[PDB]
């Protein structure tokens, strides 16, 4: 969001799913709102990271 971190967010997730790639995709299903903002401070900085 604002200050080279914005804010950190911690989770503990139980899952039937053991496979890694099918697991991260349903978090992209969940955390597209961060992925809105994962582009916004990616376009705000061409050179920052």
């Amino acid at each position: 969001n604002s200050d080279r971190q914005g804010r950190p967010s911690a989770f503990v997730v139980v899952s039937r799913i053991t496979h890694r790639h099918t697991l991260i995709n349903v978090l992209r299903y969940r955390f597209r709102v961060s992925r809105f903002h994962f582009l916004n401070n990616s376009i705000s900085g061409y050179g920052p990271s």
Partner: protein, 200 residues
């Protein structure tokens, strides 16, 4: 007289035809709304129109101002001079419709991709509310100057019933017409032969 208002009938139409020949189809403004029309809906779908010249475009802005007022209501958090850079250039563009100015928006607000880019369409839609309305005001003033002369050239048919008097009205008993009046003007050397036979 009669050839005064017959001349001014040609004067406003050639004065209008020229403006319409010269329509300022704004590319810079359209490019910047189209960029920002793309960019706000990235924010809105996550929640953290076209012919900028259409008559219908003025209620398109009137809805889309409220479409932004409904999105500025959901994100109610902006400088006073910023609102002055907004409104002062709007009133000039309503008076200087030929030359429309672009402002690199003065950036005091949140660095989120909404509140920067929404503030752009805070200004790029009041400018679209400036250019589109004020074109209609000057054009309807041009059409009202012509339609007043239309009543004046009904009175040409009220003259002595020559045939080209009846040909004058039958070319002139219509409201404004970009294509018809202009083509119509070219085929009225009969009327130059009419009025000289009328009032010498």
């Amino acid at each position: 007289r009669e050839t005064q208002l017959y001349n001014e009938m040609v004067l406003w139409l050639r004065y209008h035809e020229k403006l319409t020949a010269r329509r300022p189809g704004h590319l810079p403004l359209l490019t910047r709304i189209r960029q920002d029309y793309d960019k706000l809906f990235g924010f809105v779908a996550a929640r953290p129109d076209d012919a900028v010249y259409g008559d219908d475009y003025v209620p398109r802005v009137d809805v889309f101002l409220r479409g932004l007022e409904d999105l500025a209501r959901c994100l109610c958090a902006m400088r006073a001079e910023e609102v002055n850079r907004l409104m002062d250039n709007v009133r000039d563009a309503a008076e200087r419709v030929l030359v429309y100015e672009v402002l690199d928006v003065r950036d005091p607000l949140n660095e989120d991709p909404s509140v920067l880019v929404h503030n752009r369409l805070v200004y790029l839609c009041r400018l679209a509310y400036a250019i589109s309305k004020s074109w209609q005001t000057l054009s309807h003033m041009c059409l009202d100057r012509i339609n007043s002369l239309r009543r004046r050239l009904i009175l040409a048919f009220h003259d002595r019933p020559a045939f080209a008097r009846v040909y004058a009205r039958n070319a002139l008993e219509r409201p404004v017409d970009g294509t018809t009046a202009y083509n119509l003007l070219r085929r009225l050397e009969e009327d130059f032969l009419l009025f000289r036979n009328a009032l010498r």
